[PDB]
Amino acid sequence: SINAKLVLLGDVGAGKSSLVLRFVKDQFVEFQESTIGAAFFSQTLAVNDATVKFEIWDTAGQERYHSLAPMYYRGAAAAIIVFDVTNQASFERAKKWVQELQAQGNPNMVMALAGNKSDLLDARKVTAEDAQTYAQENGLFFMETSAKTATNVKEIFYEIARRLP
């Protein structure tokens, strides 16, 4: 009985589609091949003797489409800003989404900084420290996630649902 609009922000290849597909369908490309797209989902969740119905809006992450994003995040109760821990430019871009969301919407939004592909070791380029520190100073929370192994996928959405004003 609690409706929430949730935007997914982040640049191409970060794992936006993978994250929400894991969360919604319990699927990942390596184990279960494709069935439906992932730009929009409605998903219900139980939190502390209640219910949250997430309406999940994906956004185009390419730079040429950046100026269109306010149309998507308008009135969102929440946002997951996704970055790929193996890609430093993705993290720089995730930081810009956060500042913009703070500048140009919307005071009681629940923002979650997701650091995805955590399963990847050799290739990791963004420290949990930088991401954690950044989040701690900007009123949001950082969670490392993996769509591949399902680590912290369900948890990050619960943790947003927990915080809904």
Ligand X SMILES: Nc1nc2c(ncn2[C@@H]2O[C@H](COP(=O)(O)OP(=O)(O)O)[C@@H](O)[C@H]2O)c(=O)[nH]1
Where is the binding site, in residues? 10-18, 58-62, 116-119, 146-147
Which positions touch ligand X (CB under 6 A)?
Answer: 10, 12-18, 29, 61, 116-117, 119-120, 146-148
Binding partner at 116 among ligand X, other proteins, none, C-beta below 5 to 8 Å by kind:
ligand X
Beta bridge partners of 83: 115
Q: How far is the CB of 22 from ligand X (least distance, A)?
A: 8
Count of helices and strands (H, E) across the chain: 5, 6
Q: What are phi and psi of 105, to 5 degrees?
A: -145, -165
Q: Looking at beta carbons only, is 12 or 128 nearer to ligand X?
A: 12
Q: Which residues make up each annotated binding site for GTP?
A: 10-18, 58-62, 116-119, 146-147
Give me the DSSP letters along 77-121.
Answer: SEEEEEEETT-HHHHHHHHHHHHHHHHHS-TT-EEEEEEE-TT--
Q: How far is the CB of 134 from ligand X (least distance, A)?
A: 20
